[PDB]
Amino acid sequence: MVVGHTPTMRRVFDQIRRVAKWNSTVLVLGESGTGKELIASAIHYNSPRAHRPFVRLNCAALPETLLESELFGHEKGAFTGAVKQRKGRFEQADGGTLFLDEIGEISPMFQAKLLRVLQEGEFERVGGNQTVRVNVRIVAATNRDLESEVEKGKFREDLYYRLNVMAIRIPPLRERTADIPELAEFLLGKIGRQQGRPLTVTDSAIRLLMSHRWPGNVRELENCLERSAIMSEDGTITRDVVSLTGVDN
């Protein structure tokens, strides 16, 4: 389902089903479009927790107060908007795999709290004081440069060390261009079979992929091949057809 053959892929791919089996936290280091969500998904489907809930959480998309509440749970009325008591992500996914996207945007004060939990598997509600030992698995992920934040003091160092414990650095597609032909074929073959017509890409676009720096990695690659196929009446994605998807050179 996931393709790649460069030496960098050997670490990332083998790390996928590796940490899949264990209960250890996972930090998925990588820029946008690297696969962090799907790396965790491939991790989950290859984890014994494949049969258990798989939770994806973006720590940057939630307020600090809501972020602390979500992971450990909160009592009713703890903050504005808490109309009903909500079970924490640590407990809702107890025995499950927790994907924490953009883990590096958490506040310094909470970072101390998350540290203790990751050491002993014990945590407290936001407002509760009953210590619960949980066989919880974590999958962190961050594209932020936490090193600057710890350097600037906005990120606690103790947790950052505890967060980058399972660092799986998904390399940019720029360093693994040898995988581009193998990466594109799986998507192109899938969409070609899916649409009922051969969705082929011209050689001119292929040269672009080899020379592309890939700030967005395969996400920008995927958004184009799928749109390109649409206006290619025969499915033959031509570079002009590639251009209509809005991908910058």
Binding site: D14, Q15, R17, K21, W22, P48, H51
Partner: protein, 497 residues
């Protein structure tokens, strides 16, 4: 009333040997045929005793009976063997009667006989042919028997009696025949009614406790023509029935063993393949954690210290620790096996589970575990590596069995079921054990965690492995939490429609 010369001509013209002798059996007259049959000339016959025709083979009781009844003035009838002038021997049916004068006194003896060589040549040929059936019957290793229209055993061999002794309590061939008729059914009835020879029909006997005996059954109609004298011009045929029964028991069962053994053989490599992948999945995982924490530390101590960082012995300390691990992570990751595409072939899941149960049956009965297998009548075959899907069965069943040894198992039972639910082949292996503690239902799935100590075969890997096989199929495996009288593991895997 007739002229005496007519009686003289009556004897003379006969084609049989007729002789008139004195009281001493000296031939005084002979017809044309007596010369022809006995080979003696007209002049050579006068005066010779009838004792010359005896060759000594006839019992003396026959001759004394012949002569004894003559002294009683009574005819005597019997069959003799006479010798012709050329010394050839033929069966001569001789009857000698007295010649009574007008006063009733015996004056002469009468010697008549007819050629009956054909008679004996055919009964002995019958006796020989009767011996032919008796001897040929004795030779067949296949239990063979000839049945008449009433299905009576006319001849049986030791093997059929041995089969009767081996298959029937009494050891009699007749009793063995009765049982075979019921099992043969159509081929026997077709043979009985139409006489059509049937060959190669296999039947099965499950006698309990012993491997069922599978027999190769063959048969043919055996035809006898009518013998009675009045049907010489129009013989009519009857029908016996032949049943030939050959032992092919070990042949058919042994087919099961090899495929059963290739079954455990082919799967046996995967748990290594998953085991080698799983066992090594622990190496980097345990390394990846502590190592990366250090890899950050160099970038940590570097940024705040900046220029002085390069002179900090601490900054070198974590760098060395991180670099050593990073080398391992690359070397450990770079040499990981890449699975070859195991030939995806049509796999009969019920076929395997019926088979894997056969391999693991012995240790199930060792614990008194009742194996109740209910293969799905119509289960689609999955396009995949037979070996890999085969392997995951043993991992799940074995661990459940070890729970069968625990005293919480009031009744020791192994339950294996296959069904298609949610468009997936749902494999449920339920057991009557104490089960897994609810808090440890997943920690057991953690690699190397074993509630039973790792001091036994409990590498904490069987549950991780089944997931990897299940995961390789993009499936899902879970323990049914509703069942608490043991551990019920549920495996959902895609199948080829």
């Amino acid at each position: 009333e007739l002229l005496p010369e007519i009686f003289r001509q009556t004897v003379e013209h006969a084609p049989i040997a007729i002789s008139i002798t004195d009281l001493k059996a000296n031939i005084l007259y002979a017809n044309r045929a007596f010369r022809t049959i006995t080979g003696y000339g007209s002049e050579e016959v006068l005066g010779k005793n009838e004792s010359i025709l005896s060759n000594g083979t006839t019992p003396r009781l026959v001759y004394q009976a012949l002569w004894g009844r003559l002294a009683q003035k009574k005819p005597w009838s019997g069959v003799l063997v006479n010798r012709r002038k050329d010394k050839t021997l033929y069966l001569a049916e001789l009857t000698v009667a007295p010649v009574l004068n007008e006063a009733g006194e015996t004056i002469y003896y009468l010697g008549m006989h007819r050629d009956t060589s054909e008679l004996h040549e055919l009964e002995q040929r019958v006796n020989n042919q009767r011996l032919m059936i008796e001897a040929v019957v004795n030779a067949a290793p296949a239990a063979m028997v000839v049945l008449d229209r009433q299905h009576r055993v006319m001849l049986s061999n030791p093997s059929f009696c041995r089969l009767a002794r081996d298959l029937v309590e009494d050891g009699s061939s007749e009793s063995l025949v009765a049982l075979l008729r019921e099992n043969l059914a159509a081929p026997f009835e077709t043979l009985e009614n139409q006489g059509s020879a049937f060959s190669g029909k296999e039947i099965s006997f499950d006698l309990g406790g012993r491997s069922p005996r599978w027999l190769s059954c063959h048969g043919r109609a055996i035809h006898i023509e009518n013998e009675q004298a009045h049907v010489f011009f129009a013989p009519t045929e009857e029908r016996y029935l032949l049943l030939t029964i050959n032992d092919i028991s070990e042949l058919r069962q042994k087919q099961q063993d090899s495929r059963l053994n290739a079954l455990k053989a082919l799967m046996a490599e995967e748990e290594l393949l998953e085991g080698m992948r799983e066992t090594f999945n622990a190496a980097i995982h345990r390394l990846q954690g502590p190592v990366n924490l250090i890899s950050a530390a160099m970038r940590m101590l570097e940024r705040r210290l900046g220029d002085k960082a390069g002179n900090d012995p601490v900054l070198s300390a974590m760098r060395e620790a991180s670099t050593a691990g990073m080398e391992a992570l690359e070397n450990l990751s770079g040499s990981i096996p890449v699975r070859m595409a195991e030939s995806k072939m049509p796999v009969n899941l019920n076929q395997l589970i019926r088979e894997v149960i056969t391999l693991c049956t012995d240790q199930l009965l060792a614990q008194g575990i009742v194996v109740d297998w209910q293969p799905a009548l119509r289960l689609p075959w999955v396009m995949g590596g037979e070996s890999s899907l085969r392997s995951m069965i043993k991992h799940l069943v074995d661990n459940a069995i070890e729970s069968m040894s625990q005293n919480q198992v009031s009744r020791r039972e192994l339950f294996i079921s296959t069904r298609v639910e949610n468009h997936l082949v749902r494999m449920e292996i339920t057991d009557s054990g104490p089960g897994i503690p609810p808090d440890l239902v997943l920690k057991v799935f953690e690699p190397f965690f074993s509630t039973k100590p790792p001091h036994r075969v409990g590498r904490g890997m069987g549950l991780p492995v089944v997931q990897e096989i299940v995961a390789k199929h993009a499936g899902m495996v879970h323990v049914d939490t509703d069942y608490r009288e043991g551990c019920r593991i549920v495996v959902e895997l895609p199948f080829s429609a």
